[PDB]
């Protein structure tokens, strides 16, 4: 019942086709040097570079409306810091140590899918659990999760297993935000599947 207006309808619609998936997928021209974007955007692979955290942005920045996408991140390919969220065009996408790079600054917001913590302007210590509460605490992030960006309310939230888990972050209005992840695992293959948009004020 905390879902963005329009999300249920957006998710029930026929999914965007492979062309749309590529168009809204990872950007080969906007990722870490240590990442390769494959299949025209459908997934990326992080090369096995030591002492590096590496990010990617989607090709398309969202300034309005409701957008959603599915991230597929194999359970065995997460390593010590696997973070899923969004970033402005200004967020850094590489650093020379293993860390929750996405969410470590003012330009990025991330959920640590290993630890369950939220990062925005955070170096890690003290970061809050999401979703809050006992159900939320025991939640495991399976291979697939949905990322939901509501630019009318200015929220980012997530869904697993058919259930929206609530807004994770507020304070996103008046930005242009891109799908983003940060990864540390050699040879991880992280997929993005765009699920579409509802551009109108109430979606």
């Amino acid at each position: 019942l905390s879902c963005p207006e329009g999300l249920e309808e957006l998710l029930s619609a026929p999914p965007p086709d492979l062309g749309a998936q590529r168009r809204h997928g990872w950007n080969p021209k906007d990722c870490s040097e240590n990442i390769e974007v494959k299949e025209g955007g459908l997934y990326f692979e992080r090369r096995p570079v030591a002492q590096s955290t590496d990010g990617a942005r989607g090709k398309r920045g969202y300034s309005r409306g409701l957008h959603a996408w599915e991230i597929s991140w194999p359970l065995e390919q997460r390593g010590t810091h696997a973070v899923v969220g969004v970033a402005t065009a200004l967020a850094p996408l590489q650093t020379d140590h293993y860390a929750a790079l996405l969410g470590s600054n003012s330009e990025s917001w991330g959920w640590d899918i290993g630890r369950g913590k939220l990062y925005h302007q955070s170096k890690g210590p003290g970061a809050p659990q999401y979703p809050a509460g006992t159900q939320g605490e025991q939640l495991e992030v399976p291979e697939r999760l949905l990322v939901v960006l509501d630019m009318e309310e200015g929220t980012l939230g997530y869904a697993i297993g058919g259930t929206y888990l609530g807004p994770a972050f507020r304070g996103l209005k008046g930005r242009t935000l891109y799908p983003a992840v940060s990864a540390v695992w050699g040879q991880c293959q992280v997929r993005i599947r765009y699920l579409g948009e509802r551009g109108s004020h109430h979606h």
């Binding site: 096995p48 570079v49 590096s52 390593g79 010590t80 293993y98 540390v184 050699g186 040879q187």
Partner: peptide
């Protein structure tokens, strides 16, 4: 390259 994160 053989480290904790498969590098």
């Amino acid at each position: 390259r053989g480290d904790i994160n498969n590098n």
